[PDB]
Amino acid sequence: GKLPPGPSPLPVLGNLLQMDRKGLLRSFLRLREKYGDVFTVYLGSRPVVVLCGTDAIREALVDQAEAFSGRGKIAVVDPIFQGYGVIFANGERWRALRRFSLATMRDKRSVEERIQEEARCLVEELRKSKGALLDNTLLFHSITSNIICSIVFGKRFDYKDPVFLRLLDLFFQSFSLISSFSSQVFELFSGFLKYFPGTHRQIYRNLQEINTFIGQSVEKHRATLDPSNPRDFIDVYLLRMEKDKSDPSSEFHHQNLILTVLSLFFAGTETTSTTLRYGFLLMLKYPHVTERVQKEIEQVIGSHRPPALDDRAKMPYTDAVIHEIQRLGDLIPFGVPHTVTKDTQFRGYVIPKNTEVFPVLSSALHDPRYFETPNTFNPGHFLDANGALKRNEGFMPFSLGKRICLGEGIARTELFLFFTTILQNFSIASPVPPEDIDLTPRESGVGNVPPSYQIRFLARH
Numbered sequence: 001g002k003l004p005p006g007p008s009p010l011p012v013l014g015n016l017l018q019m020d021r022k023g024l025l026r027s028f029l030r031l032r033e034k035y036g037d038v039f040t041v042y043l044g045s046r047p048v049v050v051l052c053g054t055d056a057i058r059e060a061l062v063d064q065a066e067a068f069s070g071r072g073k074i075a076v077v078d079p080i081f082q083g084y085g086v087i088f089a090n091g092e093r094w095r096a097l098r099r100f101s102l103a104t105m106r107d108k109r110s111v112e113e114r115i116q117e118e119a120r121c122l123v124e125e126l127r128k129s130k131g132a133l134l135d136n137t138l139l140f141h142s143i144t145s146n147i148i149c150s151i152v153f154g155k156r157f158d159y160k161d162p163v164f165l166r167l168l169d170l171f172f173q174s175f176s177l178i179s180s181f182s183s184q185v186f187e188l189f190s191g192f193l194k195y196f197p198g199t200h201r202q203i204y205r206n207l208q209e210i211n212t213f214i215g216q217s218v219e220k221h222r223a224t225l226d227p228s229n230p231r232d233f234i235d236v237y238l239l240r241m242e243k244d245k246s247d248p249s250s251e252f253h254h255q256n257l258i259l260t261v262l263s264l265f266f267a268g269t270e271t272t273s274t275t276l277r278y279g280f281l282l283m284l285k286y287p288h289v290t291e292r293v294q295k296e297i298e299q300v301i302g303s304h305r306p307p308a309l310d311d312r313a314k315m316p317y318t319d320a321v322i323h324e325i326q327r328l329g330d331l332i333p334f335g336v337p338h339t340v341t342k343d344t345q346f347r348g349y350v351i352p353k354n355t356e357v358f359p360v361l362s363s364a365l366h367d368p369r370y371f372e373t374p375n376t377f378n379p380g381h382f383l384d385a386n387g388a389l390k391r392n393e394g395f396m397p398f399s400l401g402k403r404i405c406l407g408e409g410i411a412r413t414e415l416f417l418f419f420t421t422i423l424q425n426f427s428i429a430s431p432v433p434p435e436d437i438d439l440t441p442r443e444s445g446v447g448n449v450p451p452s453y454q455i456r457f458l459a460r461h
Protein backbone atom coordinates (compact mmCIF):
# COMPACT_ATOMS: atom_id res chain seq x y z
CA GLY A 1 0.00 0.00 0.00
CA LYS A 2 0.85 3.70 0.44
CA LEU A 3 0.86 5.57 -2.87
CA PRO A 4 2.96 8.71 -3.37
CA PRO A 5 1.59 11.62 -1.28
CA GLY A 6 -1.29 13.70 -2.62
CA PRO A 7 -4.42 15.71 -1.85
CA SER A 8 -7.51 14.02 -0.39
CA PRO A 9 -9.72 12.88 -3.29
CA LEU A 10 -13.50 12.92 -3.51
CA PRO A 11 -15.38 9.70 -4.44
CA VAL A 12 -16.38 10.87 -7.95
CA LEU A 13 -14.76 14.26 -8.63
CA GLY A 14 -11.31 13.05 -7.52
CA ASN A 15 -9.02 16.04 -7.06
CA LEU A 16 -11.04 18.38 -9.31
CA LEU A 17 -11.05 21.07 -6.61
CA GLN A 18 -7.25 20.96 -6.26
CA MET A 19 -6.80 21.52 -10.00
CA ASP A 20 -5.88 24.72 -11.86
CA ARG A 21 -8.19 26.25 -14.52
CA LYS A 22 -5.23 26.79 -16.91
CA GLY A 23 -4.88 23.07 -17.74
CA LEU A 24 -3.59 19.64 -16.71
CA LEU A 25 0.08 20.62 -16.97
CA ARG A 26 -0.48 23.74 -14.84
CA SER A 27 -2.28 21.55 -12.30
CA PHE A 28 0.53 18.94 -12.31
CA LEU A 29 3.17 21.65 -11.81
CA ARG A 30 1.18 23.40 -9.05
CA LEU A 31 0.91 20.18 -7.03
CA ARG A 32 4.68 19.63 -7.31
CA GLU A 33 5.17 22.87 -5.34
CA LYS A 34 3.29 21.30 -2.41
CA TYR A 35 3.79 17.53 -2.74
CA GLY A 36 7.20 17.19 -4.42
CA ASP A 37 8.61 15.38 -7.46
CA VAL A 38 6.52 12.19 -7.11
CA PHE A 39 2.86 12.38 -6.11
CA THR A 40 -0.58 10.86 -6.63
CA VAL A 41 -3.45 12.83 -8.12
CA TYR A 42 -6.92 11.45 -8.76
CA LEU A 43 -8.21 12.40 -12.18
CA GLY A 44 -11.81 11.47 -11.45
CA SER A 45 -12.25 8.08 -9.80
CA ARG A 46 -8.84 6.80 -11.00
CA PRO A 47 -5.38 7.45 -9.48
CA VAL A 48 -2.37 8.56 -11.51
CA VAL A 49 1.25 8.92 -10.38
CA VAL A 50 2.91 12.07 -11.68
CA LEU A 51 6.69 12.26 -12.13
CA CYS A 52 8.48 15.61 -12.04
CA GLY A 53 12.15 16.51 -12.55
CA THR A 54 14.84 14.77 -14.60
CA ASP A 55 16.12 12.53 -11.80
CA ALA A 56 12.71 10.99 -10.99
CA ILE A 57 11.75 10.39 -14.63
CA ARG A 58 15.09 8.60 -15.19
CA GLU A 59 14.65 6.60 -11.97
CA ALA A 60 11.43 5.17 -13.39
CA LEU A 61 11.71 5.05 -17.20
CA VAL A 62 15.42 4.19 -17.28
CA ASP A 63 16.27 2.47 -13.97
CA GLN A 64 13.06 0.42 -13.71
CA ALA A 65 12.41 0.36 -17.47
CA GLU A 66 10.33 -2.85 -17.56
CA ALA A 67 8.03 -1.74 -14.72
CA PHE A 68 7.30 1.55 -16.49
CA SER A 69 7.03 0.07 -19.99
CA GLY A 70 3.21 0.02 -19.84
CA ARG A 71 1.02 2.32 -21.95
CA GLY A 72 -1.91 4.24 -20.45
CA LYS A 73 -5.10 5.32 -22.21
CA ILE A 74 -6.02 8.77 -23.46
CA ALA A 75 -9.80 9.22 -23.18
CA VAL A 76 -10.39 11.14 -26.44
CA VAL A 77 -8.64 8.70 -28.80
CA ASP A 78 -9.01 5.33 -27.05
CA PRO A 79 -12.35 4.62 -28.82
CA ILE A 80 -10.40 4.63 -32.11
CA PHE A 81 -7.33 2.65 -31.03
CA GLN A 82 -8.85 0.42 -28.31
CA GLY A 83 -5.45 -1.01 -27.35
CA TYR A 84 -4.64 -1.83 -30.98
CA GLY A 85 -1.72 -0.31 -32.90
CA VAL A 86 1.88 0.22 -31.78
CA ILE A 87 1.43 3.29 -29.52
CA PHE A 88 -1.44 2.00 -27.38
CA ALA A 89 -0.72 -1.73 -27.42
CA ASN A 90 0.54 -3.53 -24.30
CA GLY A 91 2.19 -6.75 -23.12
CA GLU A 92 3.07 -9.16 -25.93
CA ARG A 93 1.12 -7.15 -28.53
CA TRP A 94 3.20 -3.99 -28.04
CA ARG A 95 6.48 -5.95 -27.91
CA ALA A 96 5.55 -7.68 -31.18
CA LEU A 97 4.29 -4.56 -32.99
CA ARG A 98 7.17 -2.31 -31.90
CA ARG A 99 9.80 -4.89 -32.87
CA PHE A 100 8.17 -5.23 -36.28
CA SER A 101 7.87 -1.45 -36.65
CA LEU A 102 11.51 -0.88 -35.73
CA ALA A 103 12.82 -3.71 -37.94
CA THR A 104 10.64 -2.66 -40.90
CA MET A 105 11.79 0.97 -41.04
CA ARG A 106 15.38 0.01 -40.09
CA ASP A 107 15.57 -1.21 -43.73
CA LYS A 108 14.96 0.57 -52.31
CA ARG A 109 15.13 4.24 -51.17
CA SER A 110 16.42 5.00 -47.67
CA VAL A 111 14.40 7.15 -45.27
CA GLU A 112 17.16 9.80 -45.53
CA GLU A 113 16.75 10.01 -49.32
CA ARG A 114 12.96 10.23 -49.05
CA ILE A 115 13.32 13.19 -46.65
CA GLN A 116 15.89 14.78 -48.99
CA GLU A 117 13.38 14.41 -51.84
CA GLU A 118 10.68 16.12 -49.78
CA ALA A 119 13.20 18.80 -48.85
CA ARG A 120 13.97 19.41 -52.54
CA CYS A 121 10.23 19.46 -53.28
CA LEU A 122 9.58 22.00 -50.53
CA VAL A 123 12.35 24.35 -51.71
CA GLU A 124 10.88 24.28 -55.23
CA GLU A 125 7.44 25.12 -53.81
CA LEU A 126 8.83 27.94 -51.68
CA ARG A 127 10.56 29.47 -54.73
CA LYS A 128 7.14 29.70 -56.44
CA SER A 129 5.73 31.98 -53.69
CA LYS A 130 8.61 34.29 -54.73
CA GLY A 131 9.10 35.73 -51.23
CA ALA A 132 5.48 36.51 -50.39
CA LEU A 133 4.00 36.32 -46.88
CA LEU A 134 2.59 32.92 -45.91
CA ASP A 135 1.54 30.87 -42.91
CA ASN A 136 3.81 27.80 -43.04
CA THR A 137 1.40 25.57 -41.06
CA LEU A 138 -0.04 23.80 -44.11
CA LEU A 139 3.25 23.08 -45.92
CA PHE A 140 4.89 21.96 -42.69
CA HIS A 141 2.07 19.46 -42.18
CA SER A 142 2.33 18.29 -45.79
CA ILE A 143 6.06 17.53 -45.74
CA THR A 144 5.93 15.68 -42.39
CA SER A 145 2.90 13.64 -43.46
CA ASN A 146 4.50 13.03 -46.86
CA ILE A 147 7.39 11.29 -45.12
CA ILE A 148 4.96 8.95 -43.36
CA CYS A 149 2.92 8.54 -46.58
CA SER A 150 6.21 7.53 -48.20
CA ILE A 151 6.99 4.97 -45.50
CA VAL A 152 3.44 3.64 -45.34
CA PHE A 153 1.78 4.07 -48.75
CA GLY A 154 4.97 3.97 -50.80
CA LYS A 155 4.50 7.45 -52.29
CA ARG A 156 3.90 11.15 -51.64
CA PHE A 157 1.29 13.78 -52.52
CA ASP A 158 1.54 17.09 -54.40
CA TYR A 159 1.10 20.11 -52.09
CA LYS A 160 -2.07 21.37 -53.82
CA ASP A 161 -3.72 17.93 -54.13
CA PRO A 162 -7.32 18.54 -52.93
CA VAL A 163 -8.08 15.09 -51.48
CA PHE A 164 -4.71 15.15 -49.67
CA LEU A 165 -5.42 18.64 -48.33
CA ARG A 166 -8.97 17.70 -47.26
CA LEU A 167 -7.82 14.68 -45.24
CA LEU A 168 -4.81 16.61 -43.93
CA ASP A 169 -7.18 19.42 -42.86
CA LEU A 170 -9.37 17.12 -40.74
CA PHE A 171 -6.54 14.96 -39.38
CA PHE A 172 -4.72 18.04 -38.09
CA GLN A 173 -7.71 19.92 -36.69
CA SER A 174 -8.00 16.77 -34.56
CA PHE A 175 -4.80 17.63 -32.66
CA SER A 176 -6.21 21.09 -32.00
CA LEU A 177 -9.29 19.43 -30.47
CA ILE A 178 -7.23 16.81 -28.59
CA SER A 179 -5.19 19.56 -26.89
CA SER A 180 -8.28 21.65 -26.01
CA PHE A 181 -9.46 22.41 -22.47
CA SER A 182 -12.69 20.56 -23.28
CA SER A 183 -10.79 17.35 -24.10
CA GLN A 184 -8.86 17.64 -20.84
CA VAL A 185 -12.19 17.87 -19.02
CA PHE A 186 -13.14 14.74 -21.01
CA GLU A 187 -10.00 12.99 -19.71
CA LEU A 188 -11.31 13.16 -16.13
CA PHE A 189 -15.02 12.45 -16.69
CA SER A 190 -15.28 10.33 -19.86
CA GLY A 191 -17.45 7.80 -17.99
CA PHE A 192 -20.24 10.39 -17.84
CA LEU A 193 -19.32 12.74 -20.71
CA LYS A 194 -19.22 10.04 -23.43
CA TYR A 195 -23.04 10.03 -23.74
CA PHE A 196 -23.03 13.76 -24.53
CA PRO A 197 -21.92 15.84 -27.55
CA GLY A 198 -18.39 17.22 -27.41
CA THR A 199 -14.94 17.38 -28.99
CA HIS A 200 -14.58 13.59 -28.68
CA ARG A 201 -17.21 12.88 -31.38
CA GLN A 202 -15.42 15.14 -33.88
CA ILE A 203 -12.06 13.53 -33.14
CA TYR A 204 -13.88 10.22 -33.57
CA ARG A 205 -15.24 11.11 -37.05
CA ASN A 206 -11.95 12.60 -38.21
CA LEU A 207 -9.80 9.62 -37.27
CA GLN A 208 -12.37 7.16 -38.66
CA GLU A 209 -12.35 9.00 -42.00
CA ILE A 210 -8.60 8.37 -42.11
CA ASN A 211 -8.93 4.77 -40.92
CA THR A 212 -11.33 4.38 -43.86
CA PHE A 213 -8.69 5.84 -46.21
CA ILE A 214 -6.07 3.52 -44.75
CA GLY A 215 -8.43 0.53 -45.02
CA GLN A 216 -8.86 1.02 -48.75
CA SER A 217 -5.13 1.72 -49.22
CA VAL A 218 -4.44 -1.65 -47.59
CA GLU A 219 -6.78 -3.14 -50.21
CA LYS A 220 -5.04 -1.38 -53.14
CA HIS A 221 -1.87 -2.89 -51.68
CA ARG A 222 -3.34 -6.40 -51.25
CA ALA A 223 -4.31 -6.18 -54.94
CA THR A 224 -1.09 -4.71 -56.36
CA LEU A 225 1.16 -6.81 -54.12
CA ASP A 226 4.40 -8.29 -55.43
CA PRO A 227 5.79 -10.59 -52.69
CA SER A 228 9.29 -10.44 -54.22
CA ASN A 229 9.38 -6.64 -53.95
CA PRO A 230 7.46 -5.06 -51.00
CA ARG A 231 7.16 -1.33 -51.70
CA ASP A 232 6.37 -0.01 -48.20
CA PHE A 233 5.25 -0.58 -44.59
CA ILE A 234 1.86 -2.03 -45.61
CA ASP A 235 3.30 -4.56 -48.08
CA VAL A 236 5.75 -5.83 -45.44
CA TYR A 237 2.89 -6.13 -42.95
CA LEU A 238 0.75 -8.01 -45.48
CA LEU A 239 3.56 -10.47 -46.20
CA ARG A 240 3.95 -10.91 -42.45
CA MET A 241 0.22 -11.76 -42.26
CA GLU A 242 0.81 -14.48 -44.85
CA LYS A 243 3.73 -15.87 -42.81
CA ASP A 244 1.58 -15.99 -39.66
CA LYS A 245 -1.52 -17.67 -41.17
CA SER A 246 -1.11 -20.85 -39.09
CA ASP A 247 -0.17 -19.07 -35.83
CA PRO A 248 -3.35 -18.34 -33.81
CA SER A 249 -1.46 -16.07 -31.37
CA SER A 250 -0.13 -13.71 -34.07
CA GLU A 251 -0.91 -10.02 -33.60
CA PHE A 252 -0.43 -9.29 -37.29
CA HIS A 253 -4.00 -8.90 -38.49
CA HIS A 254 -6.38 -6.19 -39.65
CA GLN A 255 -7.06 -4.04 -36.58
CA ASN A 256 -3.35 -3.85 -35.73
CA LEU A 257 -2.54 -3.11 -39.37
CA ILE A 258 -5.01 -0.22 -39.68
CA LEU A 259 -4.28 1.28 -36.29
CA THR A 260 -0.50 0.94 -36.52
CA VAL A 261 -0.58 2.87 -39.82
CA LEU A 262 -2.72 5.56 -38.18
CA SER A 263 -0.42 5.44 -35.13
CA LEU A 264 2.53 6.32 -37.40
CA PHE A 265 0.51 9.22 -38.83
CA PHE A 266 -0.94 10.20 -35.46
CA ALA A 267 2.48 10.35 -33.78
CA GLY A 268 4.94 10.96 -36.61
CA THR A 269 3.39 14.03 -38.26
CA GLU A 270 2.07 16.68 -35.86
CA THR A 271 4.88 17.20 -33.33
CA THR A 272 7.48 17.13 -36.10
CA SER A 273 5.47 19.71 -38.06
CA THR A 274 4.96 21.75 -34.91
CA THR A 275 8.65 21.56 -33.92
CA LEU A 276 9.59 22.89 -37.37
CA ARG A 277 6.97 25.63 -37.08
CA TYR A 278 8.19 26.60 -33.60
CA GLY A 279 11.75 26.40 -34.93
CA PHE A 280 11.22 29.14 -37.48
CA LEU A 281 9.43 31.42 -35.00
CA LEU A 282 12.49 31.30 -32.74
CA MET A 283 14.66 31.75 -35.83
CA LEU A 284 12.67 34.91 -36.56
CA LYS A 285 12.92 36.15 -32.96
CA TYR A 286 16.69 35.61 -33.02
CA PRO A 287 18.24 36.55 -36.41
CA HIS A 288 21.78 36.18 -34.99
CA VAL A 289 21.18 32.52 -34.22
CA THR A 290 19.78 32.08 -37.74
CA GLU A 291 22.86 33.86 -39.13
CA ARG A 292 25.31 31.48 -37.42
CA VAL A 293 23.31 28.55 -38.62
CA GLN A 294 23.47 29.77 -42.24
CA LYS A 295 27.12 30.65 -41.68
CA GLU A 296 27.73 27.10 -40.45
CA ILE A 297 25.63 25.74 -43.34
CA GLU A 298 27.79 27.68 -45.81
CA GLN A 299 31.05 26.53 -44.20
CA VAL A 300 30.22 22.81 -44.03
CA ILE A 301 27.74 21.94 -46.80
CA GLY A 302 28.15 24.74 -49.36
CA SER A 303 25.41 26.22 -51.52
CA HIS A 304 25.41 23.55 -54.25
CA ARG A 305 24.85 20.01 -52.93
CA PRO A 306 21.82 19.36 -50.72
CA PRO A 307 22.48 18.81 -46.99
CA ALA A 308 22.86 15.17 -45.94
CA LEU A 309 22.67 13.46 -42.52
CA ASP A 310 26.43 12.97 -42.13
CA ASP A 311 26.83 16.78 -42.18
CA ARG A 312 25.15 16.98 -38.75
CA ALA A 313 28.22 15.48 -37.05
CA LYS A 314 30.22 18.32 -38.65
CA MET A 315 27.63 20.95 -37.63
CA PRO A 316 27.56 21.12 -33.81
CA TYR A 317 26.03 24.62 -33.61
CA THR A 318 23.07 23.82 -35.85
CA ASP A 319 22.62 20.58 -33.90
CA ALA A 320 22.70 22.64 -30.69
CA VAL A 321 20.05 24.98 -32.11
CA ILE A 322 17.81 22.02 -32.97
CA HIS A 323 18.25 20.57 -29.48
CA GLU A 324 17.40 23.95 -27.94
CA ILE A 325 14.32 24.38 -30.18
CA GLN A 326 13.11 20.93 -29.11
CA ARG A 327 13.83 21.70 -25.45
CA LEU A 328 12.07 25.08 -25.34
CA GLY A 329 9.30 23.95 -27.70
CA ASP A 330 8.27 21.28 -25.20
CA LEU A 331 5.66 19.78 -27.49
CA ILE A 332 4.64 16.95 -25.20
CA PRO A 333 4.80 18.63 -21.74
CA PHE A 334 3.37 15.96 -19.41
CA GLY A 335 4.48 13.26 -21.84
CA VAL A 336 2.33 10.35 -22.97
CA PRO A 337 0.84 8.27 -20.10
CA HIS A 338 2.52 5.06 -18.99
CA THR A 339 1.27 2.38 -16.65
CA VAL A 340 3.27 0.13 -14.36
CA THR A 341 3.23 -3.42 -15.73
CA LYS A 342 3.23 -4.86 -12.19
CA ASP A 343 3.20 -3.88 -8.49
CA THR A 344 6.16 -1.50 -8.34
CA GLN A 345 8.44 -0.23 -5.56
CA PHE A 346 9.48 3.35 -6.31
CA ARG A 347 11.20 5.96 -4.11
CA GLY A 348 9.83 4.39 -0.91
CA TYR A 349 6.32 4.27 -2.34
CA VAL A 350 4.51 1.30 -3.85
CA ILE A 351 2.63 1.68 -7.14
CA PRO A 352 -0.10 -0.96 -7.73
CA LYS A 353 -0.12 -2.91 -11.02
CA ASN A 354 -1.70 -1.03 -13.96
CA THR A 355 -1.68 2.36 -12.20
CA GLU A 356 -1.26 5.23 -14.66
CA VAL A 357 2.05 7.14 -14.62
CA PHE A 358 2.69 10.64 -15.97
CA PRO A 359 6.29 11.52 -16.90
CA VAL A 360 6.21 15.35 -16.97
CA LEU A 361 8.75 16.04 -19.72
CA SER A 362 8.35 19.81 -19.33
CA SER A 363 9.62 19.59 -15.74
CA ALA A 364 12.66 17.81 -17.21
CA LEU A 365 13.28 19.98 -20.29
CA HIS A 366 13.06 23.04 -18.02
CA ASP A 367 15.14 21.50 -15.19
CA PRO A 368 17.27 24.24 -13.57
CA ARG A 369 19.93 21.62 -12.74
CA TYR A 370 20.74 21.14 -16.41
CA PHE A 371 19.94 24.51 -18.00
CA GLU A 372 21.15 27.89 -16.69
CA THR A 373 18.12 29.79 -17.87
CA PRO A 374 15.34 27.24 -18.57
CA ASN A 375 12.89 29.83 -19.93
CA THR A 376 15.33 31.58 -22.29
CA PHE A 377 16.40 30.45 -25.75
CA ASN A 378 20.07 29.51 -25.59
CA PRO A 379 21.64 27.02 -28.02
CA GLY A 380 24.61 27.26 -25.63
CA HIS A 381 22.80 24.82 -23.32
CA PHE A 382 24.18 22.19 -25.71
CA LEU A 383 27.62 23.69 -26.37
CA ASP A 384 30.92 23.27 -24.53
CA ALA A 385 33.80 25.78 -24.49
CA ASN A 386 35.23 24.23 -27.68
CA GLY A 387 31.96 24.83 -29.56
CA ALA A 388 31.28 21.07 -29.52
CA LEU A 389 27.90 19.40 -28.99
CA LYS A 390 27.30 18.53 -25.36
CA ARG A 391 24.91 15.82 -24.13
CA ASN A 392 22.58 17.07 -21.42
CA GLU A 393 20.81 14.59 -19.12
CA GLY A 394 17.81 16.95 -18.87
CA PHE A 395 17.15 16.65 -22.62
CA MET A 396 14.26 14.20 -23.04
CA PRO A 397 11.75 15.45 -25.64
CA PHE A 398 11.35 11.89 -26.98
CA SER A 399 10.96 10.56 -23.43
CA LEU A 400 13.06 7.62 -22.17
CA GLY A 401 13.29 3.83 -21.87
CA LYS A 402 11.35 0.99 -23.49
CA ARG A 403 8.63 3.37 -24.65
CA ILE A 404 11.03 5.99 -26.07
CA CYS A 405 9.69 7.62 -29.24
CA LEU A 406 9.88 4.77 -31.75
CA GLY A 407 10.67 7.28 -34.52
CA GLU A 408 13.40 9.39 -32.88
CA GLY A 409 15.90 8.90 -35.72
CA ILE A 410 13.33 9.83 -38.38
CA ALA A 411 12.23 12.93 -36.46
CA ARG A 412 15.77 14.26 -35.97
CA THR A 413 16.58 13.36 -39.58
CA GLU A 414 13.51 15.34 -40.68
CA LEU A 415 14.32 18.21 -38.33
CA PHE A 416 17.96 18.51 -39.42
CA LEU A 417 17.42 18.12 -43.18
CA PHE A 418 14.39 20.40 -43.34
CA PHE A 419 15.99 23.15 -41.22
CA THR A 420 19.32 23.10 -43.08
CA THR A 421 17.94 22.71 -46.64
CA ILE A 422 15.43 25.54 -46.14
CA LEU A 423 18.01 27.92 -44.62
CA GLN A 424 20.54 27.00 -47.33
CA ASN A 425 18.21 28.36 -50.01
CA PHE A 426 16.29 30.97 -48.03
CA SER A 427 16.76 33.89 -45.66
CA ILE A 428 13.84 34.67 -43.38
CA ALA A 429 11.80 37.78 -42.56
CA SER A 430 8.47 38.63 -40.92
CA PRO A 431 6.35 41.83 -40.64
CA VAL A 432 6.55 41.38 -36.86
CA PRO A 433 9.72 42.84 -35.28
CA PRO A 434 11.85 40.21 -33.46
CA GLU A 435 11.40 41.84 -30.02
CA ASP A 436 7.61 41.90 -30.56
CA ILE A 437 7.39 38.16 -31.34
CA ASP A 438 5.29 36.20 -28.84
CA LEU A 439 6.14 32.56 -28.07
CA THR A 440 3.15 31.68 -25.85
CA PRO A 441 1.47 28.56 -27.34
CA ARG A 442 -2.05 28.92 -28.79
CA GLU A 443 -3.09 25.72 -27.00
CA SER A 444 -1.48 23.74 -24.19
CA GLY A 445 -2.36 20.13 -23.38
CA VAL A 446 -0.96 16.67 -24.14
CA GLY A 447 0.33 18.63 -27.15
CA ASN A 448 1.57 22.23 -27.36
CA VAL A 449 0.45 24.23 -30.40
CA PRO A 450 2.58 27.30 -31.29
CA PRO A 451 0.72 30.45 -32.42
CA SER A 452 0.14 30.94 -36.16
CA TYR A 453 2.41 33.49 -37.86
CA GLN A 454 3.39 34.92 -41.26
CA ILE A 455 6.87 34.39 -42.73
CA ARG A 456 8.86 35.25 -45.86
CA PHE A 457 11.18 32.79 -47.61
CA LEU A 458 13.58 34.90 -49.65
CA ALA A 459 15.77 33.08 -52.19
CA ARG A 460 19.53 33.48 -51.71
CA HIS A 461 21.53 34.20 -54.87
Ligand code: HEM
Nearest residue numbers: 087267268271272275332336398399403405406407410411
Ligand atom coordinates in the same frame (compact mmCIF):
# COMPACT_ATOMS: atom_id res chain seq x y z
C1 HEM B 1 9.35 16.20 -33.18
C2 HEM B 1 9.52 14.87 -33.26
C3 HEM B 1 8.89 13.88 -32.24
C4 HEM B 1 8.85 13.98 -30.90
C5 HEM B 1 9.41 15.11 -30.02
C6 HEM B 1 8.16 12.80 -30.40
C7 HEM B 1 7.91 12.52 -29.08
C8 HEM B 1 7.37 11.36 -28.58
C9 HEM B 1 7.03 11.09 -27.20
C10 HEM B 1 7.22 12.06 -26.01
C11 HEM B 1 6.54 9.85 -27.13
C12 HEM B 1 6.04 9.13 -25.87
C13 HEM B 1 7.05 8.09 -25.40
C14 HEM B 1 6.65 7.66 -24.02
O1 HEM B 1 5.76 6.78 -23.88
O2 HEM B 1 7.20 8.21 -23.04
C15 HEM B 1 6.55 9.30 -28.47
C16 HEM B 1 6.11 8.04 -28.81
C17 HEM B 1 6.07 7.49 -30.07
N1 HEM B 1 6.47 8.10 -31.24
FE1 HEM B 1 7.16 10.07 -31.31
N2 HEM B 1 7.80 12.01 -31.46
C18 HEM B 1 8.24 12.64 -32.62
C19 HEM B 1 8.07 12.16 -33.90
C20 HEM B 1 7.80 10.86 -34.25
C21 HEM B 1 8.06 10.23 -35.53
C22 HEM B 1 8.70 10.91 -36.76
C23 HEM B 1 7.64 8.96 -35.45
C24 HEM B 1 7.71 7.89 -36.56
C25 HEM B 1 7.12 8.10 -37.75
C26 HEM B 1 7.11 8.74 -34.12
C27 HEM B 1 6.59 7.56 -33.65
C28 HEM B 1 6.29 7.26 -32.34
C29 HEM B 1 5.73 6.01 -31.89
C30 HEM B 1 5.35 4.78 -32.75
C31 HEM B 1 5.58 6.16 -30.37
C32 HEM B 1 5.03 5.13 -29.37
C33 HEM B 1 6.12 4.11 -29.08
C34 HEM B 1 5.71 3.15 -27.99
O3 HEM B 1 4.71 3.42 -27.28
O4 HEM B 1 6.39 2.12 -27.83
N3 HEM B 1 7.22 9.92 -33.41
N4 HEM B 1 7.06 10.24 -29.32
Ligand SMILES: OC[C@H]1O[C@H](O[C@H]2[C@H](O)[C@@H](O)[C@H](OCCCCCC3CCCCC3)O[C@@H]2CO)[C@H](O)[C@@H](O)[C@@H]1O
Nearest residue numbers: 145149157161163164165167168169171172210213265
Ligand atom coordinates in the same frame (compact mmCIF):
# COMPACT_ATOMS: atom_id res chain seq x y z
O1 LIG C 1 -2.67 9.85 -60.55
C1 LIG C 1 -4.07 9.68 -60.80
C2 LIG C 1 -4.55 8.30 -60.32
O2 LIG C 1 -4.19 8.11 -58.94
C3 LIG C 1 -5.29 8.15 -58.03
O3 LIG C 1 -4.86 8.18 -56.67
C4 LIG C 1 -5.62 9.11 -55.89
C5 LIG C 1 -6.40 8.35 -54.80
O4 LIG C 1 -7.81 8.57 -54.99
C6 LIG C 1 -6.02 8.66 -53.35
O5 LIG C 1 -5.10 7.66 -52.89
C7 LIG C 1 -5.39 10.04 -53.10
O6 LIG C 1 -6.01 10.69 -51.99
C8 LIG C 1 -5.07 10.75 -50.91
C9 LIG C 1 -5.58 11.61 -49.76
C10 LIG C 1 -4.44 11.82 -48.76
C11 LIG C 1 -4.59 10.95 -47.52
C12 LIG C 1 -3.31 10.96 -46.69
C13 LIG C 1 -3.58 11.58 -45.32
C14 LIG C 1 -3.68 10.47 -44.27
C15 LIG C 1 -3.06 10.84 -42.92
C16 LIG C 1 -3.23 12.32 -42.58
C17 LIG C 1 -2.66 13.26 -43.65
C18 LIG C 1 -2.45 12.56 -44.99
O7 LIG C 1 -5.44 10.87 -54.27
C19 LIG C 1 -4.75 10.25 -55.35
C20 LIG C 1 -4.40 11.31 -56.40
O8 LIG C 1 -2.98 11.43 -56.51
C21 LIG C 1 -6.23 6.97 -58.31
O9 LIG C 1 -5.53 5.72 -58.18
C22 LIG C 1 -6.80 7.11 -59.72
O10 LIG C 1 -8.17 7.50 -59.60
C23 LIG C 1 -6.06 8.13 -60.60
O11 LIG C 1 -6.23 7.76 -61.98
Ligand SMILES: *C(=O)Cc1cc2ccccc2c2ccccc12
Nearest residue numbers: 087178267270271272336446447
Ligand atom coordinates in the same frame (compact mmCIF):
# COMPACT_ATOMS: atom_id res chain seq x y z
C1 LIG D 1 3.47 14.86 -31.39
O1 LIG D 1 3.99 13.89 -31.95
C2 LIG D 1 2.07 14.83 -30.83
C3 LIG D 1 1.66 13.58 -30.11
C4 LIG D 1 2.44 12.43 -30.15
C5 LIG D 1 2.04 11.27 -29.50
C6 LIG D 1 2.86 10.15 -29.55
C7 LIG D 1 2.47 8.99 -28.90
C8 LIG D 1 1.27 8.96 -28.19
C9 LIG D 1 0.46 10.08 -28.13
C10 LIG D 1 0.84 11.25 -28.78
C11 LIG D 1 0.04 12.40 -28.73
C12 LIG D 1 -1.16 12.39 -28.03
C13 LIG D 1 -1.96 13.52 -27.98
C14 LIG D 1 -1.56 14.68 -28.64
C15 LIG D 1 -0.36 14.70 -29.35
C16 LIG D 1 0.45 13.56 -29.40
